Structures are given as structure tokens and as C-alpha cells.
Coordinates of C-alpha atoms and ligand atoms in Angstrom, one line a residue:
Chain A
X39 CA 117.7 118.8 80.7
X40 CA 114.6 117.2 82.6
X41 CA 113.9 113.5 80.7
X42 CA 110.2 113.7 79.2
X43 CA 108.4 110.3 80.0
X44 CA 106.0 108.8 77.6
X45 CA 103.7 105.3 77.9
X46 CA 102.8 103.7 74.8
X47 CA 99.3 101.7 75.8
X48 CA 97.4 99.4 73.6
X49 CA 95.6 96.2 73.8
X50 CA 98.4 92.6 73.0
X51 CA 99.8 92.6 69.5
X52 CA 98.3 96.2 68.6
X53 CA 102.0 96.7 67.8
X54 CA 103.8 98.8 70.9
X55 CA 107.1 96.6 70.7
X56 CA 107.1 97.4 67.0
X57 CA 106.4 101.2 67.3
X58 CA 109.2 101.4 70.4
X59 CA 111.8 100.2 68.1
X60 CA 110.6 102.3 65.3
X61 CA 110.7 105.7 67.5
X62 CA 114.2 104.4 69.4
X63 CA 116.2 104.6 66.0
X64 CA 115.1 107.9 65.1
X65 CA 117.3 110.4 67.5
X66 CA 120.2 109.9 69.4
X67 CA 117.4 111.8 71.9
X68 CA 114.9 109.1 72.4
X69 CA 115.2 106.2 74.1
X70 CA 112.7 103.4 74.9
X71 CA 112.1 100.9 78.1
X72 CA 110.6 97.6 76.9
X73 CA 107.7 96.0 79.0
X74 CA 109.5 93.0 81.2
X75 CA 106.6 90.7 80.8
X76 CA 106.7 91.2 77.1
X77 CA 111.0 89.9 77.6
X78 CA 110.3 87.1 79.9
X79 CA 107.6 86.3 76.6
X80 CA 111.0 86.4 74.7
X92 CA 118.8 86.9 83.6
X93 CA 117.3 85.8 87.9
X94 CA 114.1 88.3 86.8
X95 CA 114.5 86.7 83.0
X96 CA 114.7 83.1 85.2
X97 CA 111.8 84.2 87.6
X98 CA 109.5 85.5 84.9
X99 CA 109.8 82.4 82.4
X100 CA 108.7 80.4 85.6
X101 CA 105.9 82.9 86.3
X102 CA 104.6 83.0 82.8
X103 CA 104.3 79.2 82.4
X104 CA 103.2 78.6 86.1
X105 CA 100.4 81.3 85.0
X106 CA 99.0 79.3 81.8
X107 CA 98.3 76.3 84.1
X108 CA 97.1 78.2 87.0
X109 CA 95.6 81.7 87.1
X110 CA 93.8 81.6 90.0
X111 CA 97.1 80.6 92.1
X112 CA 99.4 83.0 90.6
X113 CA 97.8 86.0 89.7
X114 CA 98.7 88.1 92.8
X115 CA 102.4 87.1 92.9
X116 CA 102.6 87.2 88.9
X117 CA 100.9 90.9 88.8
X118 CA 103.4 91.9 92.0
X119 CA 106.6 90.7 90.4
X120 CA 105.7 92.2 86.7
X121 CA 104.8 95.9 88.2
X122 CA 108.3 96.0 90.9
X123 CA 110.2 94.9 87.2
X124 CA 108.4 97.8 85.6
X125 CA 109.1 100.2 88.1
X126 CA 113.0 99.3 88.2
X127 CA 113.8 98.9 84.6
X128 CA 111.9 102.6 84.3
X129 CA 114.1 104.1 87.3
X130 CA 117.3 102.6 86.0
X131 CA 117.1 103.9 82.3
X132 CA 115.5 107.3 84.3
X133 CA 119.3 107.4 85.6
X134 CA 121.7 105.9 83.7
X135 CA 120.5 107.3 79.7
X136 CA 120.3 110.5 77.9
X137 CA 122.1 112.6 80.4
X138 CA 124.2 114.1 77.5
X139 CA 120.7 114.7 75.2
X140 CA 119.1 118.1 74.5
X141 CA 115.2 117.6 74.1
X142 CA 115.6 113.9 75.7
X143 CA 112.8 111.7 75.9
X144 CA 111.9 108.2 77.5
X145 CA 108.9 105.8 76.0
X146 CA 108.0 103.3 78.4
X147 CA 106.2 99.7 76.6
X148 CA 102.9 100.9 79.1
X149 CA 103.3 101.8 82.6
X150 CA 102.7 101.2 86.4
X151 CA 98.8 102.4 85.5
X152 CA 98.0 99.8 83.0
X153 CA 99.4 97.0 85.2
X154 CA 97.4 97.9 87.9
X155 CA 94.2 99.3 86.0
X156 CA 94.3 97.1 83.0
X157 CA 95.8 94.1 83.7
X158 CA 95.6 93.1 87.2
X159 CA 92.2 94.7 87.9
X160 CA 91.5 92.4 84.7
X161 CA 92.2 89.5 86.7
X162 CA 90.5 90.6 89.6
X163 CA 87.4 90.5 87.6
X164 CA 87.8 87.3 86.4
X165 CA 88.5 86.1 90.2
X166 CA 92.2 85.1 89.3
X167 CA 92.6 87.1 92.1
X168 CA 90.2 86.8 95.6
X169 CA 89.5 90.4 97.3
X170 CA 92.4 90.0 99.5
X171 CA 94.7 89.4 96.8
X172 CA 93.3 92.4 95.2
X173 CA 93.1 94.8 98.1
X174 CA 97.0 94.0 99.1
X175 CA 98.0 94.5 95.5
X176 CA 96.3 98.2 95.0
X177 CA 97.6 99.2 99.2
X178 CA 101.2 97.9 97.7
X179 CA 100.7 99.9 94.2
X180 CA 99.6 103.0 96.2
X181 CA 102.2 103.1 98.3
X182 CA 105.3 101.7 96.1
X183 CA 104.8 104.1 93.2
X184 CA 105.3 107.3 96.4
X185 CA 108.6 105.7 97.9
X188 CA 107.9 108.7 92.3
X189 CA 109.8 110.5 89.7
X190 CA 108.0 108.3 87.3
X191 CA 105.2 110.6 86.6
X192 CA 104.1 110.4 83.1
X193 CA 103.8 113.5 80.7
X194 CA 101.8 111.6 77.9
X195 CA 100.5 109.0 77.3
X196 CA 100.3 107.8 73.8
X197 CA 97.2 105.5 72.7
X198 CA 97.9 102.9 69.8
X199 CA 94.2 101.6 69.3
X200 CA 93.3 98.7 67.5
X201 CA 90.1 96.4 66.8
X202 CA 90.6 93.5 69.0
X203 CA 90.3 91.5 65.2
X204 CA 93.2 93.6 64.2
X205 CA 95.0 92.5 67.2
X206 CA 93.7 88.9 67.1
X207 CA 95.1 88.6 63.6
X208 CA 98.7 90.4 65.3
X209 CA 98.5 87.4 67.8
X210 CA 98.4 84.9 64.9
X211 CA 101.2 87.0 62.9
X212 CA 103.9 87.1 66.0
X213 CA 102.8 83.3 66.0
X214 CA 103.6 82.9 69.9
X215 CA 102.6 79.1 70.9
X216 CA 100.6 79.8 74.1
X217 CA 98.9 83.4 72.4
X218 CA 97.3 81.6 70.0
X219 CA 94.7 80.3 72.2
X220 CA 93.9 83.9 72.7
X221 CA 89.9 84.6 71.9
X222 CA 88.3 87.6 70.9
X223 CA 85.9 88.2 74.0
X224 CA 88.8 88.6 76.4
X225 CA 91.0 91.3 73.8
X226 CA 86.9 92.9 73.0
X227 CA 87.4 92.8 77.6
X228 CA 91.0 94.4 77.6
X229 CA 90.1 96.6 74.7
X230 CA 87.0 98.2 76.3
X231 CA 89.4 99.1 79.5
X232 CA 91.5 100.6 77.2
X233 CA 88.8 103.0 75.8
X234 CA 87.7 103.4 79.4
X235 CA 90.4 104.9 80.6
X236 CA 92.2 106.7 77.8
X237 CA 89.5 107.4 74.8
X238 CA 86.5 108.8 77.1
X239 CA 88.5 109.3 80.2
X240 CA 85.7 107.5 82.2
X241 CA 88.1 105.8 84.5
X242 CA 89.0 106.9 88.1
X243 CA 92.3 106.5 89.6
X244 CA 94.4 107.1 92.8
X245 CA 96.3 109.0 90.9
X246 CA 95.2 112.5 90.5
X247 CA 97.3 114.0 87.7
X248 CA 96.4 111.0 85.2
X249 CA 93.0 113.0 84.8
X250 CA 94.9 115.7 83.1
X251 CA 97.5 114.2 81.4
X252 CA 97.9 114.5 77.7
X253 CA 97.0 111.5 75.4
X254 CA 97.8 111.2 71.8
X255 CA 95.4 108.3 70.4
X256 CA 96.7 106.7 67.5
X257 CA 95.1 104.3 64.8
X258 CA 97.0 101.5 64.3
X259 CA 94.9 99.3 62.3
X260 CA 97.0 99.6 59.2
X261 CA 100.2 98.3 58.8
X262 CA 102.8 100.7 59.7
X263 CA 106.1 98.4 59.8
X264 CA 107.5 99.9 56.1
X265 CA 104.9 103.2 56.1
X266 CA 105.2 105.0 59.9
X267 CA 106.4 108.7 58.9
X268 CA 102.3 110.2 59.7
X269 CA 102.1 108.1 62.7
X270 CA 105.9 109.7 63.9
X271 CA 104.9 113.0 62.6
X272 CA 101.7 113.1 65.4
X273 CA 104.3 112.0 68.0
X274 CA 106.9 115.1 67.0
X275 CA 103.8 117.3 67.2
X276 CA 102.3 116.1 70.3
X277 CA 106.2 116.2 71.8
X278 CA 106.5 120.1 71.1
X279 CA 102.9 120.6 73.2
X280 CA 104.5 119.0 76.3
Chain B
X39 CA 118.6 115.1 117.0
X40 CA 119.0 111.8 115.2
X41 CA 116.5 109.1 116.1
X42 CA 118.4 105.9 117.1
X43 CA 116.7 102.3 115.3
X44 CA 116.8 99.3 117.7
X45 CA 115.4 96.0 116.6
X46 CA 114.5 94.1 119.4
X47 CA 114.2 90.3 118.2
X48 CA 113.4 86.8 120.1
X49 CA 111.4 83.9 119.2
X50 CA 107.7 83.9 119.5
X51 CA 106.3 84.6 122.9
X52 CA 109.6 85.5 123.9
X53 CA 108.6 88.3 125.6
X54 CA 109.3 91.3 123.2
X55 CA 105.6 93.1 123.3
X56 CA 106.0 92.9 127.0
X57 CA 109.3 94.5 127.7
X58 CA 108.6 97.4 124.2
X59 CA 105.7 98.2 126.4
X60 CA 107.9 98.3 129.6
X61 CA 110.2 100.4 127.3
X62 CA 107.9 103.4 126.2
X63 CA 106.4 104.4 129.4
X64 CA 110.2 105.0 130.8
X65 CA 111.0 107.8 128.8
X66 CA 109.4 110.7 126.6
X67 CA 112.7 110.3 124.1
X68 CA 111.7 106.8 123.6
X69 CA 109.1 105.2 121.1
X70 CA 108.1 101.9 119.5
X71 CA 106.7 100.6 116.4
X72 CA 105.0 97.2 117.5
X73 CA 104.8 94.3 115.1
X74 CA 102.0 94.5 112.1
X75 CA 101.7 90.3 112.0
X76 CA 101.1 90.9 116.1
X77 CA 98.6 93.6 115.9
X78 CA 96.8 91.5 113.2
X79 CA 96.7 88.7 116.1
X80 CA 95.0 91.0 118.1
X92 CA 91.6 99.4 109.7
X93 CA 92.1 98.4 105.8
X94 CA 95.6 96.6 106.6
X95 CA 93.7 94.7 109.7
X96 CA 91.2 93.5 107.6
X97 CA 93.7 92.0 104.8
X98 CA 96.1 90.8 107.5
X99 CA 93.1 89.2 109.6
X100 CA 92.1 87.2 106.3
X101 CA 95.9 86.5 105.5
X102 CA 96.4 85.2 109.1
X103 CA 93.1 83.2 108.8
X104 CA 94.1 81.7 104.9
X105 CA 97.3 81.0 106.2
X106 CA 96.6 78.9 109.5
X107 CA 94.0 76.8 106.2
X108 CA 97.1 76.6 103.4
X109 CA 100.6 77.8 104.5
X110 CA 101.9 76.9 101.1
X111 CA 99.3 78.5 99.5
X112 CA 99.6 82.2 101.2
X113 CA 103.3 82.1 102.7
X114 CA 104.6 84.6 99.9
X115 CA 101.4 87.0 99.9
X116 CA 101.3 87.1 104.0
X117 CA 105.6 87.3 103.9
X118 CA 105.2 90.3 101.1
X119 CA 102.6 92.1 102.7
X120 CA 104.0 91.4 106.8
X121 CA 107.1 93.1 105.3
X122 CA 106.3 95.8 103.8
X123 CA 103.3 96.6 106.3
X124 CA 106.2 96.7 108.8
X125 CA 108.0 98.9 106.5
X126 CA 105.4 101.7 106.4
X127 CA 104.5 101.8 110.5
X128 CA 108.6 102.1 110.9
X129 CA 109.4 104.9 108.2
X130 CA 105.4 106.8 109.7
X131 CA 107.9 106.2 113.4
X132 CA 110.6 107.9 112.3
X133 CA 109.0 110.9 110.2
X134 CA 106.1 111.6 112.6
X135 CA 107.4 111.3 116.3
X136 CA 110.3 112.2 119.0
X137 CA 111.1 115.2 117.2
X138 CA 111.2 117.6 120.1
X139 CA 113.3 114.6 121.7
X140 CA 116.7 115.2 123.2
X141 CA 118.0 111.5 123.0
X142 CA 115.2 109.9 120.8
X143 CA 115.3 106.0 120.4
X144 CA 113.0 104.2 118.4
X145 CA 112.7 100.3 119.7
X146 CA 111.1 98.5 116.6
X147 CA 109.5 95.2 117.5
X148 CA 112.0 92.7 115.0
X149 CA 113.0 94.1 111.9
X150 CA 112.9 94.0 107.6
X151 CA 115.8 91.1 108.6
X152 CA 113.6 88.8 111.0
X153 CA 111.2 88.9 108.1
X154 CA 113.4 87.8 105.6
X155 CA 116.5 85.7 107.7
X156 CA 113.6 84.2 110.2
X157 CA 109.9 83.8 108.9
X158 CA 110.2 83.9 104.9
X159 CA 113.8 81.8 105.0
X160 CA 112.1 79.2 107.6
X161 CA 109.1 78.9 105.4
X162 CA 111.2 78.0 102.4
X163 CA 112.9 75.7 104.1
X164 CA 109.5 74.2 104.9
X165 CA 108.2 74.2 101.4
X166 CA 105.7 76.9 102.2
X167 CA 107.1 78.6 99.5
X168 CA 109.2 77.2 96.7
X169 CA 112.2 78.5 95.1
X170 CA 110.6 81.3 92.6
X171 CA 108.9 82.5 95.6
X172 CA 111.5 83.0 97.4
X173 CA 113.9 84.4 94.8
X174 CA 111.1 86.6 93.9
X175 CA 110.5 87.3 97.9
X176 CA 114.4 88.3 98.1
X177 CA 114.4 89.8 94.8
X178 CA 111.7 92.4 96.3
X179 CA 113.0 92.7 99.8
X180 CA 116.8 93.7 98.1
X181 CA 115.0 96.0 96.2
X182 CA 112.4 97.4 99.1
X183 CA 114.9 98.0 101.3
X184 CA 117.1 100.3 99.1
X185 CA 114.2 102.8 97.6
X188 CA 116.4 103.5 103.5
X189 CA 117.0 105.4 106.6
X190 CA 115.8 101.8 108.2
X191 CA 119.4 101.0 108.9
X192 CA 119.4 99.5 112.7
X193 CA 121.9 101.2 115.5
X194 CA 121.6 98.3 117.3
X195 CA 119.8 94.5 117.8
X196 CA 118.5 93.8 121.6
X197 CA 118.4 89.6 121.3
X198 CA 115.5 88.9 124.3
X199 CA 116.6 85.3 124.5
X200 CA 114.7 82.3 125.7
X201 CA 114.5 78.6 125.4
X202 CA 111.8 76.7 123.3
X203 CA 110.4 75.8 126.5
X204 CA 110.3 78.9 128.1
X205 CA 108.5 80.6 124.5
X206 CA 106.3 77.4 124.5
X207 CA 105.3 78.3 128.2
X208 CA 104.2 81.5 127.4
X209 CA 102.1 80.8 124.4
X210 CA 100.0 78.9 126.6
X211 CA 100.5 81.5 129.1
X212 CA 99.3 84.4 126.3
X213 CA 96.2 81.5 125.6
X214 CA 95.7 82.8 122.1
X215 CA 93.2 79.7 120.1
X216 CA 95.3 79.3 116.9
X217 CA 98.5 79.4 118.6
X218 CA 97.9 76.4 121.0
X219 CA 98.9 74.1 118.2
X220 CA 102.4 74.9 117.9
X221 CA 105.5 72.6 118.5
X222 CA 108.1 72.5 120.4
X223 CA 109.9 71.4 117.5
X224 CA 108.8 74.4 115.8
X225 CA 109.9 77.0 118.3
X226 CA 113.5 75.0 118.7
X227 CA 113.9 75.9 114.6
X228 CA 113.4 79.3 115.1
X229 CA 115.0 79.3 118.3
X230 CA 118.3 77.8 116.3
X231 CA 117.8 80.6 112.9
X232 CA 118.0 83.0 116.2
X233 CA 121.0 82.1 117.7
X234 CA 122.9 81.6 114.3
X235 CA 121.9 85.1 113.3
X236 CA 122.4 87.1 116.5
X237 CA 124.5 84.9 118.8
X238 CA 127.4 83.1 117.0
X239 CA 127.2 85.7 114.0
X240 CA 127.4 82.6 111.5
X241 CA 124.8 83.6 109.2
X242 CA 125.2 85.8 106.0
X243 CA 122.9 88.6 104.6
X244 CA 122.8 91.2 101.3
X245 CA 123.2 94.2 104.4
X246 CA 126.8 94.0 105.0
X247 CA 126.3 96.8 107.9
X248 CA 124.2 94.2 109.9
X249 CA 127.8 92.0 110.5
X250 CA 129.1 95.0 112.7
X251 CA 126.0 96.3 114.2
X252 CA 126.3 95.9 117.8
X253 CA 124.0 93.2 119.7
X254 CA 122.7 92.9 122.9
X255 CA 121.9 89.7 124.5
X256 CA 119.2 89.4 127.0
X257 CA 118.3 86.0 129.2
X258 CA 114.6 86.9 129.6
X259 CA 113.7 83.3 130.8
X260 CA 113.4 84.6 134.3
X261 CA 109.9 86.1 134.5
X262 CA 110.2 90.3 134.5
X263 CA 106.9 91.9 134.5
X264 CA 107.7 93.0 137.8
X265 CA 111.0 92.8 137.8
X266 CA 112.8 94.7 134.8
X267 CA 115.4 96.7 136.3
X268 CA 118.8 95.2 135.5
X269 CA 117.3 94.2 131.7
X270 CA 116.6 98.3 131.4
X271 CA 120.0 98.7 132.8
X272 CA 121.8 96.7 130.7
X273 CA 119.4 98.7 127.9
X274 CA 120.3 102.1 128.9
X275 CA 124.6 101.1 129.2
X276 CA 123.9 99.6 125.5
X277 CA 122.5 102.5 124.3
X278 CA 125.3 104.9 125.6
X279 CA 127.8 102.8 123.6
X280 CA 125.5 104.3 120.3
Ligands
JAQ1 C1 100.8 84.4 81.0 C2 99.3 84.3 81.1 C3 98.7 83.1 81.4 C4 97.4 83.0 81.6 C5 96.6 84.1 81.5 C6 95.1 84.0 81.7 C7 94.4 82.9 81.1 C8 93.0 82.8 81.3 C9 92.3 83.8 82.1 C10 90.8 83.7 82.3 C11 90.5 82.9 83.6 N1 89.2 82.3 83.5 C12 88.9 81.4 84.7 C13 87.6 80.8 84.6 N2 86.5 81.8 84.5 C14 85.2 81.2 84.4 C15 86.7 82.7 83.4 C16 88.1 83.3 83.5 C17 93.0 84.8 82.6 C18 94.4 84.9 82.4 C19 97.1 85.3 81.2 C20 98.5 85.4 81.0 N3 99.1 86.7 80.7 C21 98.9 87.9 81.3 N4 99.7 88.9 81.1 C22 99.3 89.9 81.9 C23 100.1 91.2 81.9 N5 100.7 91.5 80.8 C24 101.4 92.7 80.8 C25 101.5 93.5 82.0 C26 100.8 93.0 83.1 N6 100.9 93.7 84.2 N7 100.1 91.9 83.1 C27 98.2 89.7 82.6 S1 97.6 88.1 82.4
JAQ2 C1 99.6 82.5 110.9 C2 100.3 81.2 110.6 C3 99.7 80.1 110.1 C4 100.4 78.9 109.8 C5 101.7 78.9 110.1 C6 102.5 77.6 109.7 C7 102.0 76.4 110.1 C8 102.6 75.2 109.8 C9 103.9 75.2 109.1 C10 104.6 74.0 108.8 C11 104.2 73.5 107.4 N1 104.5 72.0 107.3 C12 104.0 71.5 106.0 C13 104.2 70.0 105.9 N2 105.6 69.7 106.0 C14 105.8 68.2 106.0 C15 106.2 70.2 107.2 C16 105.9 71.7 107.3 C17 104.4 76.5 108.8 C18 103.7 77.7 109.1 C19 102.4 80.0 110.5 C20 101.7 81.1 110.8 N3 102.4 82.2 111.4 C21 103.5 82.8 110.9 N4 103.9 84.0 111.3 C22 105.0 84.4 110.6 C23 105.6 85.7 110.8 N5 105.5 86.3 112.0 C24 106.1 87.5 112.2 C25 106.8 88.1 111.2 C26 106.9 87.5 110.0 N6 107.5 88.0 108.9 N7 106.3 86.3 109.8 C27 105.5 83.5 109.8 S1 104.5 82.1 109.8
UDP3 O1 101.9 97.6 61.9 C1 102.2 96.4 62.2 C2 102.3 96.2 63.6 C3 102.6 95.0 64.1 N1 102.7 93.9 63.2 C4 103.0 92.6 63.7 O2 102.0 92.3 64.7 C5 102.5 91.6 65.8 C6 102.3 92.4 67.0 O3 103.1 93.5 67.2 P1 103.9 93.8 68.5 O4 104.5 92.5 69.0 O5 104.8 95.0 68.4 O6 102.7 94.1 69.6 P2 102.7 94.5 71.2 O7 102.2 93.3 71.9 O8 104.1 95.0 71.5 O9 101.7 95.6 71.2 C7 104.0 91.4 65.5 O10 104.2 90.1 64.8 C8 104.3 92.5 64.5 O11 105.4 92.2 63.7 C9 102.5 94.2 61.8 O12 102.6 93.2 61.1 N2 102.3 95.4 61.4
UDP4 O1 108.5 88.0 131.6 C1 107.5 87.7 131.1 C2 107.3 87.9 129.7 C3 106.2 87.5 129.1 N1 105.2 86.9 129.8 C4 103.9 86.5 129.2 O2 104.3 85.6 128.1 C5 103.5 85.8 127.0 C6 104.4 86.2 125.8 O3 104.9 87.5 125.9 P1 104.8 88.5 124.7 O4 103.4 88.4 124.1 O5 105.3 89.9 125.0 O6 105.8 87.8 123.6 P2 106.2 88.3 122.1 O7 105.6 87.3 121.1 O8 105.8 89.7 121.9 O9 107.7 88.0 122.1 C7 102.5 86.9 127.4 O10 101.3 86.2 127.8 C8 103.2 87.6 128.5 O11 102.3 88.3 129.4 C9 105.4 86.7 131.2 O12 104.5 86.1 131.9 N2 106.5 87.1 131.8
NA5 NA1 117.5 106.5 70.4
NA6 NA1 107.8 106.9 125.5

């Protein structure tokens, strides 16, 4: 019938890859569209991104715009393409995309904007290109679900994955990302061009303990918050 | 009935916001989408492509992907706003676009590449987005009108135009472009992703012969092209 699309949202290392590929094994039903910064992180966009990423750690301030740009467009096609090639035979099917076209604009890149990474230019072309790129969309979200985390909990996550160029990572930028995070999905504080976000369902989980061996609560809030959509 | 897309392409004071503004007042089944990068040479798009213009004249190989990005898909949005908005009560409706999607990409972006303006993640990133851009379209040209000059001629009338920022520019320049032109829409030699473009029809015009005043056989040789669409 009509795919239901879910974003997972959380702060690095609060543990969205892990949840994805707990949820994805579970029914023949669900399937799951992983984040392509988060593969370039691990084959032209794999080749591109790698070059992006590293060109990135030297060099915000240069390649924030272009970075930002490149991630969203792999966002939008890898969510399109599993939007029309999966689950066409499934019953109750259902799609959970590693964040979405919202957090990369409203998180991340705004983020960077902030921390002039990117000039006003830079920033103004990217949100007149996000407008317009995500109408040119049958991406519309029904849910969003929230895994929330301390930034210490996820500071200690960036230590566990053990990633050489995360563990310079400090608290006071995940406490920065963090605090967007409960901006926009926790009090709802946050204004978008995007009208129906204000009204979308969100499902805010804590993820604070280790739920790698011990996830059946955490799934069983996802099933119900499923059957309200 | 069906609009009909003409690109009309030439070098750099060629002569093509000239004769597109010859072209409109001729007929009430014929409209024309001028150039965004032109009309930021003279609100929101004006003010980023003013400061892109500006940054780039400072750092071409700093801004070349941002200004190439934006250029683009600025002139997408004015062409698909053409073709959904106007010459709908139109008998024989044409549409004269001043260049195309493919100037953009096979011209500009591929010449400043090939200057090191950009360097080879931008432009597989640039082509990555423009493949992509362009498929997400009812673009797709009828026809090409080549408004051929010499670099002597197009150098001529920059100084004739007198714009500040322009004076600067070389011969040796305009004969690069000049030569990208010819290969694309002359001799046919050059390859693209758009396999329609290989057997969309072309006409050349000499326009090194002044024709402010004097347009008759070029809107003649115009008006026979179009009959063959
Ligand atoms: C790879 C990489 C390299 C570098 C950075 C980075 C480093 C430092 C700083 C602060 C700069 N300061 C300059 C001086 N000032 C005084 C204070 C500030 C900002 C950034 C960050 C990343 N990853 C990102 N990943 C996303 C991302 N992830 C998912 C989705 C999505 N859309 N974006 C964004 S940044
Ligand atoms: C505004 C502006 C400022 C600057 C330049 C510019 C200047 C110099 C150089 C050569 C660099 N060299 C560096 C050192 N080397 C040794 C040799 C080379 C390249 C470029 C050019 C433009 N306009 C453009 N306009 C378009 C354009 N127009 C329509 C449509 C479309 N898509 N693009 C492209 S560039
Ligand atoms: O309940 C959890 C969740 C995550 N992790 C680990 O914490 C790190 C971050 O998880 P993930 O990469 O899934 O985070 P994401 O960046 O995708 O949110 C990884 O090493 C996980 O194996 C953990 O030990 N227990
Ligand atoms: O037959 C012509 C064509 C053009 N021009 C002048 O040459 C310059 C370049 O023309 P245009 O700006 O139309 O060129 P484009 O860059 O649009 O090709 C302008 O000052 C025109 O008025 C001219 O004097 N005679
Ligand atoms: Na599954
Ligand atoms: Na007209």
C-alpha cells in the first residue's frame, strides 16, 4: 500500500546506525535508508564523499557550502530510490530514514552557518536550493522518531565506535547540536519552511542505556507509535 | 498547444540579449527566459548572484562551484516558471531560452575545470548534480540557434556594451570559448550524458555583421527553422 516514512534523529553516536539495523531485521515490512555521510564515514559518491570528509577536517570554512550541498542531494536520492525500488510486495510497509532533508539543513548546516563555516551567501544559496529542491516531494515524513541522549552519553559513543578523526570531538559542540535537537523536536520551538513539520508526530526516545542486547521496550514504543500513524 | 524550447547559444557579447529582445516583440506566441548570470550583471536571487559575481571576479577558484551550482539551477527555475506560467492561450508558442542547462555544464563549468577553477571533486560533484538536476524534465530543447561570431567581433562588443568588470577580458579567453562552441554546435565532436542533444537540430547564425537595424533574413532563417519543428 502507501510506504510510511520515518526519520530517526539524534545528536553523533546517540546510536541511530545501531537502532536502524536493529528495526531493519525485525519484518520483512521494514526497511531502513542509512545516512550517506555516515557511509562515506565508513562508489563516484563513496569516492566524492571520502574526498569531502577529509577536505572538511582541514578546512571548514572552504568547504562547508559544497560539503552540506552534496550530503543533502545524496540524502534526497538514496531516500527516492529505496521509495521506488523496496517493499512494493509489503502489507503495512515502512521506510526509516538515518535523519532526513530537515536535520541537514536545520541541524547541521545551519550549525555551520553559525559557526561562519559558511558566509551569508553560502547560507542564503543553500536554504533557496533546499526550498526549492525538496518541491521538484513525495518525501514527506509521517514521524519522526527522537533518540535523545546526554551529549556525555554520546561523547563516550564517540570514544566506543573509536573513529580516528571523532575523537577530537568536545563536549561544547555535541551540548551545541544537542540543544538544536531539543529545539526543534522536544519543545517544538523551531520554525521551518516547512509547514507540516509543525504537526508531525514525534516519538522521543531515551537512549542513554545500552540497548544493543536489551531493545524489545524501545521497539515496542516504535510498534505503538506505528499503529497511531 | 505544445510550447516549443529553443536555446539560443554564442559566446559572450555575441549578441544573444540583443536579437531575444528582437525576438519577443515579433510575436504574441513567442517568449524568452533571459540569462540569470546576465541579469545579475545588470530580488533574493540578485542579491546572492550580485555577491557571487563580485567574490568571483576576487577568487575564481574559490567560488567557481558555488556561482556554477547556483547559475544552473537559478536558470533552471526562470525556465520551468516560462513554460508553466506563459503562452498558454498561444497558437504556435515558442519559448527562446537565452543558452541552456548544457552551456552551463559543456561551456562555463567544463572551461573552468579546465582552468583549475574548480578541481576534480568539484566537478564530479558539479556533474554529479547537474545529471541528477536535470532528470527530477520537460527542459528537453526542440532546437539550438548558434548566433556565431569571432573572438574579435565578441571582444568588440564588450567594449561596445562598456560594462567595468568586463573590460579585462582576453582575447585569448573568448577564442577558448569561442573553440568549446564550435566543437559542441558546429562540427558535433563533443559528447554529453543527453543523448537527444546529438540529433537535435541546430541553426547556425553569422551575426558578425551588425543587426540592430537590420534583422530581417536572421528572423527569416528563424522562422524557416522553426517550421522544420
Ligand atoms: C567531517 C567534518 C570535518 C570538520 C567538521 C567541523 C570541525 C570544526 C568546526 C568548528 C569550526 N570553528 C572555526 C573557528 N571558530 C572560532 C569556531 C568554530 C565545525 C565543523 C565537521 C565535520 N563533520 C560534519 N558532519 C556534518 C553532517 N553530518 C551529517 C549530515 C549533515 N548534513 N552534515 C556536518 S559537519
Ligand atoms: C564573474 C566572473 C569572474 C571571474 C571569471 C574568471 C576570471 C579568470 C579566469 C581564469 C583563471 N586563471 C587562473 C590562473 N591560471 C593560470 C589561468 C586561469 C576564469 C574565470 C569569470 C567570471 N564570469 C563567468 N561567467 C560564467 C558563466 N556565465 C554564464 C553562464 C554560466 N554558467 N557561467 C562563467 S565564469
Ligand atoms: O545502545 C548502544 C548504542 C550504541 N552503542 C555504540 O555507540 C556507538 C554509536 O552508535 P551509532 O554508531 O549507532 O550512532 P549514530 O552516529 O548512528 O547515531 C557505536 O560504537 C555503538 O556500537 C552502544 O554501545 N550501545
Ligand atoms: O548586432 C549587434 C549585436 C550586438 N551589439 C552590441 O554588442 C554588445 C553585445 O550584445 P549582447 O549584450 O546582446 O550580447 P550577449 O552577451 O547577450 O550575447 C551590446 O552592447 C550590443 O548592443 C551591436 O552593436 N550590434
Ligand atoms: Na526488513
Ligand atoms: Na512576445
Amino acid at each position: 500500500t502507501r510506504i510510511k516514512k520515518i526519520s530517526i534523529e539524534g545528536n553523533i553516536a546517540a546510536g541511530k546506525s545501531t537502532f536502524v539495523n536493529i528495526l531493519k531485521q525485525l519484518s520483512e515490512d521494514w526497511e531502513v535508508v542509512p545516512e550517506p555521510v555516515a557511509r562515506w564515514s565508513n562508489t563516484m559518491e563513496q569516492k566524492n564523499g571520502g574526498n569531502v570528509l577529509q577536505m572538511m577536517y582541514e578546512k571548514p570554512e572552504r568547504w562547508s557550502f559544497t560539503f552540506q550541498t552534496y550530503a543533502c542531494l545524496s540524502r534526497i536520492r538514496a531516500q527516492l530510490a529505496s521509495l521506488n525500488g523496496k517493499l512494493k510486495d509489503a502489507e503495512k510497509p515502512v521506510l526509516f530514514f538515518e535523519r532526513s532533508v530537515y536535520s541537514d539543513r536545520y541541524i547541521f548546516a545551519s550549525n555551520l552557518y553559525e559557526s561562519e563555516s559558511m558566509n551569508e551567501t553560502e547560507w542564503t544559496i543553500y536554504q533557496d536550493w533546499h526550498d526549492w529542491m525538496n518541491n521538484q516531494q513525495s518525501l514527506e515524513l509521517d514521524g519522526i522518531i527522537y533518540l535523545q541522549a546526554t551529549p556525555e552519553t554520546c561523547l563516550h559513543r564517540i570514544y566506543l565506535r573509536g573513529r580516528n578523526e571523532e575523537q577530537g570531538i568536545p563536549l561544547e559542540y555535541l551540548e551545541k547540536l544537542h540543544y538544536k535537537h531539543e529545539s526543534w523536536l522536544l519543545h517544538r520551538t523551531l520554525k521551518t519552511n516547512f509547514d507540516y513539520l509543525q504537526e508531525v508526530p514525534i516519538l522521543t526516545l531515551d537512549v542513554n542505556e545500552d540497548f544493543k542486547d536489551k531493545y524489545e521496550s524501545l521497539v515496542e514504543k516504535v510498534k505503538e507509535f506505528l499503529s497511531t500513524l
